[PDB]
Design a protein around this ligand. Structure first.
Ligand SMILES: N[C@@H](Cc1ccccc1)C(=O)O
Ligand SMILES: N[C@@H](Cc1ccccc1)C(=O)O
Ligand SMILES: N[C@@H](Cc1ccccc1)C(=O)O
Ligand SMILES: N[C@@H](Cc1ccccc1)C(=O)O
Ligand SMILES: [Mn+2]
Ligand SMILES: [Mn+2]
Ligand SMILES: [Mn+2]
Ligand SMILES: [Mn+2]
Lengths: 457, 458, 458, 457
């Protein structure tokens, strides 16, 4: 059985915004679904009237907080599933990811001695690009639940535009629960840090992290001692992010803000912040041009073929007003390359006078296939890229601004290594990702401890 | 085609002992239930048993605390929103407008009551209604709300479709998502909300009547600021979600067990913060009351003009067996010509039980008539009068007039007669948009709040 | 014996460059100075150069900030207390009563002005006064305040005693100690202070006249609390100390250099937060104005009916050479029959300089007469009228009526005629306790605040 | 020359309070000044009308905060000059002592993981007892500035009742400045802890304290990172205390509170809290009986001849209502005796069901005369008594509640040892105390670091 929505049957956009949005979407767009234009149209028309996932005042606030990051006064933690699935979009799963993020953020806040902006990969991370249209089984590749189905059969892999509305319903339900959890005792600092004390007790390398975990606990107790109750603390904010990949979905979720900011602007209200991937960041393509029309903070992924000149051109197109925190440059080069490739990019971009956020994505540049047949990543390479990234920035005198990690609160066996010493054979036990291998809950927390030590050095 | 798209549907169950209790309670007869097949209902319940909840238990505990304060005479309850939410009107401007209307009332009422106002919206789930007549005036089976069937006057639309349970959830969670965002925003800023109230005074035909009180409120707000209170100092702005718990297939699917981190796990309906049981489904030995008994949420019961003092006491004993102030709200809808006579003996007998309920006034439901022009309508003056009569009752007994429960919208509709705009029978035809009962429009609802604030100040 | 006990008296000096500046300024002639021997004055100054300060520079910087807000039209200045403090009345009940009176006024004024009130007491140093007549009506040399000589009508007491400089300091620091404690206490709690205002309304003969405004204030306070503001949320309650800077031996001894932890060291008079220069000592080329020029404290100048617009501008140029809003307060005491005529040309000319002074009304000083029963007195109605005229002046020019400067006490004295109590010439004899000018008693001062709050609300 | 005050020429006390106050003062009183009764009377009559040094609402609040201490939920730091002098009652000196106390309190708060109640020996510590009426020079002994003069000549040593009013004027001026300093940037946590960072840089043992000082700094930064500004912190409270020694002064400074607490009570408004010394704690003497009539929190000094039974009797007389924090038992036994003498006292008092504060006074039991002729104390004995005191409590399972130390913000050379290795010969350079040797500013801060480590163990 299925549920059924009606196709609906405001004053138009300001003329200039229609023009610019049309011109952006007329450009070539890579990695798009291949479904009929008429059926896409119907689904976009449904989504043009739904309640938004986010609102403009939140995005404006995020932009403020990210400006602090870019100025060297805060740090950005971005993390969650590689690919959300409708099947796994449950309260236990969402809570776990929200918890894992909060757990990391408190460790990171302590180590950085500055605020941590928390951005989950959630409430929309339902689309992925692929280098191959045919996968290793000879099936049309799975592109995420917004496009087709994970099941390895041909009928499941057909692109289905009704997945756009299912995506939005899943996203909005998830966001609802994220808001509720963050305004609960879940986000209480003292609760979150007791979880961190259980980790130390039960990890095989818990002795290695005991001292920092105790220093944190002592820091929290000091706050309380000085007369700071929970009510004194601004409540926890977890923002929603995903890759802006499916332009039918992003364009349908655009909303025109008020002239309470001065000029009406387009905001993508599918999320607070979105990024553009390595396979869709064609400089004259639709995704970059779309990013130029929306008011949200944005990010661009930068891999090992990046040049300093092209990085500058992203800066100049996407932060044309010199607004710190509008743009995030995310670097994945792998651990064996970050120390050699990143510095020339950083130096050229810093010379422009613009202030981007420099964020490390350790995971994407460090993936291999195990002998047992699983797409995996070694924990030690993930840690080493972040280490290299910090070394780049320290030598320069620039700000290592944040990390972008794939994680879950589940005890998955997806990435090799960590204190639990996950082996190739262990991978088979709980390899649950619909896409890339995630740090499990313990490995994500171990990473935060390790990165906190980088911040303290 | 016919302008539809289908969306396909694809965790540990609740504990055995809890299920055994629930199964015993739900064996009771349930009035007004949809007539869809059991097997299809089961499949939809199973979907909904694993979805993210609309609300979470800590919010409901908090609401229970705030309602205890109401029941003790230290806070006032404002409950309002659409009579019937529809899927097609479940949009950003509409939701924003109803949230704004509620907040606009609440500030006027907070000022008049000199005490906090607990704000509960009829929203994010008010998608089912009872029908007295199985055949409507067009010869169709009756519209029962969007969770059951379609408003459109055609037989295919009116068939009871169990897939609407999921559509309802998706709508409710989306709406709640936006309510949370809005409340977290500048929308709930006191100063912003009260500027809207200043525009109302300047433009209303009876603005001169409300000017003095509106000025007194503005001077109050400006005094706060003068004393060195910024918005950041103010309590976070909370709008709770409520609806009539009617469709037991939905409500039972949305039950969850709280975690063990406070006292002990309790059973909550996480489709809303609070629910009520309506006049047509409040059979003492029926399934609706038995459901209300087993959940931990705060609950309400509508009490109309056939109520007896003895039956009201039996609600109190079934639904507040542990004597928890604020757990039970008794919602009086006598009508304006009967409230002064019927309510006191009910109040006296319940008060003698030792229990502390919240006494809430529903002015609207007892005061509905059909206009000569053919529209279901209510007179503004009879609404205002039932609230006046309710206050007189409580005044006289020394009990607390605890709140109001109204049907309102932020839209400039023409559904209720009267008010400062002097909506006539003829005006009704212009913007009669409700899928069910006539609502106070945005101006009427604000005027009601000013008039009730004067009742609170007497 | 004769009922006295003697108390025996037993650090790096200020920087040379600063001293050279000060020595040049103080070479100027100083009117109204005590006539005690130089050598004994020097010894007493030397004691006072090492004592703990009455105030500290961070408080004065903060006051300067708050006064800038007044000068910009965003806050209102309330300055009040005894005409002349005496050592013998420098007691806990008296100080408490004056602090209470000031706080009672300030809440009424804050509500009426819809903006913060900066509270400055005439206290902890108002121990010196000018005398026109070197011989008083009893044939004695005039009482000049307790810092100089004794009130008692006998020749030994009236001799100028330089030891009174130390007595004054000891009294001022003790009083300030208690003002700080009181302000840190429940005394400055809004809710406590405004309950006192409710008792005034119930017991005053004109209480019916003020009832409505008093109720509106109470509803304002209760709204704050309803919105979830507790006392702990409120700004800390600040009462600043002021007096007329008259005795330059005291003022110069109490100068200190701020430390280097903000901008650069500045020279402050730490005998008070703010001082003013009176009508008899404001010679443009005299030592009082030159002293005011060199200190960093906010300062005031009294402007009486001989003032010219040109002389007022010369005060502005000498005393606010850096164009710092709030640094200079111009305190008008025209009298009620002259303020509407004399003040506007002064205001227009000063406003044309580009500088932002605070315009403050001293109703009391221009409105003093001798009763037929032989008491120096003032009529309540002429006091209220000068403030009314001051507001009319500023209204008309679009300038800000910035504050009032009144003489008041928390005691139930009989010094000023009129008010709701209808104090008569005959009543004056009952409790005429001032060592100098007649003060508003506690009821009169509160009534004035209600009347001025109505001026602010028009 | 001298300044001159007038002898003044409320409804009487409730009858029962007059009775009890008369009965208390009729008891024998040790260590009183010998000045004529008539002249004393005149001075008491002046002091009965002066503005009080403290007010009852402050004392009630202190009693709340001390109840937290007694329950094991806060710690008490009490410190300042051994004897204040009129000559040294200056802004530079007061500020220094207030700073030194604040500096210690932040270190202690961090180490204790709980609030620190800060009580200065100030604004009245002008009277001292003496074992001998004739000192080593053959002069009538100096008893503090409230009684006679420090100068070593016979005329200066005569007891002068006018010193009562001079004392009060000095006390009130000092209290005024203490209030002003604590509501200033002086008491800002971040300012206070930068001073602690200079100490670490310039101390000879700074390397030993670097790690804790950095952990504190990181704790402070974490607070700021989590969104706690100064405005969020309740402002710093420093309470005033002294030995209640001169009964002419204490009785004259009594004030009757309101019936806003229910029953009118007598409060000694010369201070917030006072203590009774080893030489005046006669169980049936006037000082203990006076302590029983006033509502202030009080303390009793307990030296090495104390017994468990007599400790209990102080408890039962002075905390007859079982009000936690009303009574503080202060132990000085010396470092070589505390571990053996204190436990039996603690065990018997804990068995009563009453909750006193257990406070260590390291200095008084550990004084000796140097070969160079200076009354002095070794830093290492001071530290060791506190160590012993903590060991007593830990074995018991009771709460080491606080310390009572003699300190100054001046760089004095009065106590031997510390990281600066003050020698007998160094003593001569800046031996400025009018009475017992104080920890100087560095030694007081080193002590706080050391006691913080005891708290953390
Ligand atoms: N209200 C529309 C769109 C919608 C679908 C699902 C969730 C939220 C909105 C419908 O039900 O058809
Ligand atoms: N995740 C489930 C259930 C669901 C429906 C709609 C909104 C949220 C969740 C699905 O996509 O069918
Ligand atoms: N006011 C009294 C007592 C007093 C003395 C010193 C300081 C404070 C009060 C006097 O001057 O004689
Ligand atoms: N300490 C000095 C000055 C002083 C006088 C009075 C009060 C305060 C300080 C003295 O006793 O003479
Ligand atoms: Mn991935
Ligand atoms: Mn209805
Ligand atoms: Mn005067
Ligand atoms: Mn000592």
């Amino acid at each position: 059985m299925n549920w059924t929505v009606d196709i609906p049957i405001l004053p138009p956009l300001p003329t200039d915004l229609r023009t610019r949005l049309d011109a952006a979407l007329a450009k070539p767009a890579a990695q798009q679904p291949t479904w009929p234009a008429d059926q896409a149209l119907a689904m976009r028309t449904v989504l043009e009237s739904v309640p938004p996932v986010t609102v403009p005042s939140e995005i404006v606030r995020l932009q403020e907080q990210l400006a602090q990051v870019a100025k060297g006064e805060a740090f950005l933690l971005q993390g969650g599933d590689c690919a959300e699935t409708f099947m796994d979009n449950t309260e236990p799963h969402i809570r776990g990811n929200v918890r894992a993020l909060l757990q990391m953020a408190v460790v990171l806040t302590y180590g950085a001695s500055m605020p941590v902006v928390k951005v989950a990969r959630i409430a929309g991370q339902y689309a992925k690009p692929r280098s191959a249209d045919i996968d290793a089984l000879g099936l049309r590749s799975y592109r995420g639940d917004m496009i087709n189905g994970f099941a390895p059969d041909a009928a499941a892999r057909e692109h289905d535009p009704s997945r756009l509305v299912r995506a939005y319903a899943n996203a909005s339900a998830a966001m609802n629960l994220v808001r509720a959890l963050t305004s609960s005792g879940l986000a209480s600092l003292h609760l979150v840090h007791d979880w961190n004390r259980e980790f130390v007790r039960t990890s095989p390398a818990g002795a290695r992290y005991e001292a920092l975990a105790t220093e944190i606990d002592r820091g929290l107790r000091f706050m309380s001692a000085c007369g700071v109750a929970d009510r004194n603390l601004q409540t926890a904010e977890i923002y929603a992010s995903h890759e802006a990949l499916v332009l039918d979905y992003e364009r349908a979720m655009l909303r025109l803000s008020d002239g309470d900011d001065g000029e009406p602007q387009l905001f993508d209200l599918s999320a607070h912040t979105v990024w553009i991937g390595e396979r869709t960041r064609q400089i004259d393509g639709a995704h970059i041009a779309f990013a130029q029309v929306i008011a949200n903070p944005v990010g661009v992924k930068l891999g090992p073929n990046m040049t300093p000149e092209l990085a500058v051109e992203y800066v100049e197109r996407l932060d044309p007003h010199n607004k710190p925190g509008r743009l995030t440059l995310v670097s994945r080069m792998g651990n064996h390359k970050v120390r050699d490739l990143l510095p020339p990019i950083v130096e050229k971009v810093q010379a422009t006078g613009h202030q981007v956020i420099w964020q490390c994505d350790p995971m994407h540049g460090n993936t291999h296939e195990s002998s047992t047949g699983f797409k995996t990543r070694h924990f030690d390479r993930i840690v080493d890229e972040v280490q290299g990234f910090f070394e780049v920035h320290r030598a320069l005198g620039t700000h290592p601004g944040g990390i972008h990690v794939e994680i879950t609160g589940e005890n998955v066996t997806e990435c090799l290594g960590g204190a639990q010493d996950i082996s190739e054979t262990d991978l088979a036990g709980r390899y649950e990702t619909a896409c890339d291998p995630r740090l499990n809950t313990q490995q994500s927390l171990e990473l935060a401890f390790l990165v906190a030590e980088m911040l303290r050095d």
